[PDB]
Structure formats: C-alpha cells, structure tokens
Curated annotation (Swiss-Prot), chain A:
Glycans are attached at residues 15, 34. The chain holds residues 643 to 690 of 1273 of the full protein. Changing residue 31 to A: No effect on O-glycosylation by host GALNT1. Attaches the virion to the cell membrane by interacting with host receptor, initiating the infection. The major receptor is host ACE2. When S2/S2' has been cleaved, binding to the receptor triggers direct fusion at the cell membrane. When S2/S2' has not been cleaved, binding to the receptor results in internalization of the virus by endocytosis using host TFRC and GRM2 and leading to fusion of the virion membrane with the host endosomal membrane. Alternatively, may use NRP1/NRP2 and integrin as entry receptors. It comes from the Viruses. Disulfide bonds join 20-29. It comes from Severe acute respiratory syndrome coronavirus 2. Binds to host ACE2. RBD also interacts with the N-linked glycan on 'Asn-90' of ACE2. Cleavage of S generates a polybasic C-terminal sequence on S1 that binds to host Neuropilin-1 (NRP1) and Neuropilin-2 (NRP2) receptors. Interacts with host integrin alpha-5/beta-1 (ITGA5:ITGB1) and with ACE2 in complex with integrin alpha-5/beta-1 (ITGA5:ITGB1). May interact via cytoplasmic c-terminus with M protein. May interact (via N-terminus) with host bilirubin and biliverdin, thereby preventing antibody binding to the SARS-CoV-2 spike NTD via an allosteric mechanism. This is Spike protein S1.
C-alpha cells in the first residue's frame, strides 16, 4: 500500500478513521485491530 | 468545532479567516496568502 512516507507492507488499508496509534507520516497511522 | 452556516456575529466579518470550501485545501484566505508568500523546498512527496 503506497503512502507519502513510502511503501507500507504487511498492513491493510481501511477506509475508517480512528485516533492515531502508531504514526507513520503524512497523516497515516497504523494500529493493531480485528482475525486480528 | 465548526462554525454554523449562519454568520450573525453581531456585524463582525470573519470571512477572511474562516475556511473557504471552494478551494480543495480548506485553508482560509490569509492562510493561502501566507503559504504563497513562503517559498518552501523539498516537499519529499516521492520526488
Ligand atoms: C463579509 O466578508 C467580506 C468582507 O468584505 C464581504 O464579502 C465580500 O467581500 C469582497 C471584498 O473583497 C467582495 O468582493 C468584491 O465584490 C464586488 C462586488 O460584488 C465584485 O466586483 C468582486 O466580487 C467578484 O470577484 C470575482 C470576480 O472578479 C469572483 O470571485 C466573483 O465573481 C465575485 O462576484 C469583488 O471581489 C464581495 O462582493 C463580498 N461578497 C459578500 C457576499 O459580501 C462582506 O463584508 C461580507 N461577506 C459575506 C459573504 O458575509
Ligand atoms: C475506501 O474508499 C474507496 C473509495 O470509495 C472505496 O472504493 C473502497 O472500497 C473503500 N475501502 C473499502 C475496504 O471498502
């Protein structure tokens, strides 16, 4: 999944927006959620 | 918070500082002026 910071691999992009958990850059944040 | 659609602020005009929906970026008039008046470098968006 391409992002402004760079290529993100192993994570799934979701439409839904939540609070930032692990910042990445350019407003993208990663988090562990539901399986999981 | 978001300002209500009606702008009955007792005669005060905040149009030049509130967001302008017309532009793609929601920056206001003065924010756009500042951004244009500052010359940046190396945006870093995969150059
Ligand atoms: C609160 O905010 C502002 C404070 O003055 C003001 O509303 C607008 O102010 C600007 C002044 O820069 C006015 O713009 C001018 O209006 C004249 C007469 O209509 C026109 O010649 C121009 O407007 C046109 O400009 C462009 C074309 O040249 C286009 O963007 C478009 O076709 C415009 O019609 C000139 O720029 C503007 O008229 C007012 N508009 C309104 C609704 O007031 C006013 O004090 C308060 N305005 C609001 C919405 O609360
Ligand atoms: C996220 O938004 C795009 C644009 O509508 C949409 O096509 C996509 O399906 C959405 N993501 C998911 C998992 O549905």
């Amino acid at each position: 999944f391409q992002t402004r910071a760079g290529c993100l691999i192993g994570a799934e992009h979701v439409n839904n927006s939540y609070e930032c958990d692990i910042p990445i850059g350019a407003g993208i944040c990663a988090s562990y959620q539901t399986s999981q | 918070y978001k300002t209500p659609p009606i702008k009955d602020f007792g005669g005060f005009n905040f149009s030049q500082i509130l967001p302008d929906p017309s532009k793609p970026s929601k920056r206001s008039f003065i924010e756009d002026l500042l951004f244009n008046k500052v010359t940046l470098a190396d945006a870093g968006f995969i150059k």
